[PDB]
Amino acid sequence: MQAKPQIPKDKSKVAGYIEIPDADIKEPVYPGPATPEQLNRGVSFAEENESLDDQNISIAGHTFIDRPNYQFTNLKAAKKGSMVYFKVGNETRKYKMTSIRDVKPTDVEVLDEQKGKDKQLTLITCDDYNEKTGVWEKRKIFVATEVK
């Protein structure tokens, strides 16, 4: 049998599986802190807390250009009323993409963050990425709130 997984630093393990049927997405999420390298290899958490038991789950990723091998390349299809399945081991947590918008760069304080939240996965999918100069023309923020 299995159990509730924890969030380690090792990026070889899978703590959760991100599955979005509308976008045919079925990709492993790489648990741990955010590192520039790993965020170019797949999707990892932005939260420094090893707790996936918390209601605030921030995950970071990158958009698609020439490479369809990014875990959210087809995220363009998914709508604000689709189903985001965050599978932790065997437990399937369904979230709805209630809050979707692609905002402008520079301003990280475009939205006010607080600890008064619901169960939401806060995915930071930068809709651009030049590693050379370290720039991105857009940050597409996607917040999925837990459904029952």
Ligand X SMILES: *Sc1ccccc1C(=O)NCC(=O)N[C@]12C[C@H]3C[C@H](C[C@H](C3)C1)C2
> Which active-site residues does the annotation give?
62, 126
> Which of 113, 117, 135, 147 contacts ligand X by CB under 6 A?
113
Number of residues that bind ligand X (CB under 6 A): 9
The footprint of ligand X on residues 92-111 (CB under 6 A) is 108, 111
Our finding on whether 137 is near ligand X (CB under 6 A) is no
> Quick one: DSSP state of residue 115?
S
Interface with ligand X, residue 85, by CB under 6 A:
no
147 binds ligand X (CB under 6 A): no
Burial class of residue 105, CB neighbours in 10 A (0-12, 13-18, 19+): middle
- For the chain, how long is the longest CA-to-CA vector? 47
- Asked whether position 64 contacts ligand X by CB under 6 A, the answer is no
| Candidate segments 8-16, 64-72, 80-88, 133-141, binder of ligand X by CB under 6 A | 133-141
Q: Which structure tokens are listed for 116? A: 């008064």
133, 94 contact by CB (below 8 A)? no
Beta strand pairing call for 56-62 and 139-146: unpaired
For binding to ligand X (CB under 6 A), which residues are involved? 108, 111, 113, 122, 124, 126, 136, 139, 141
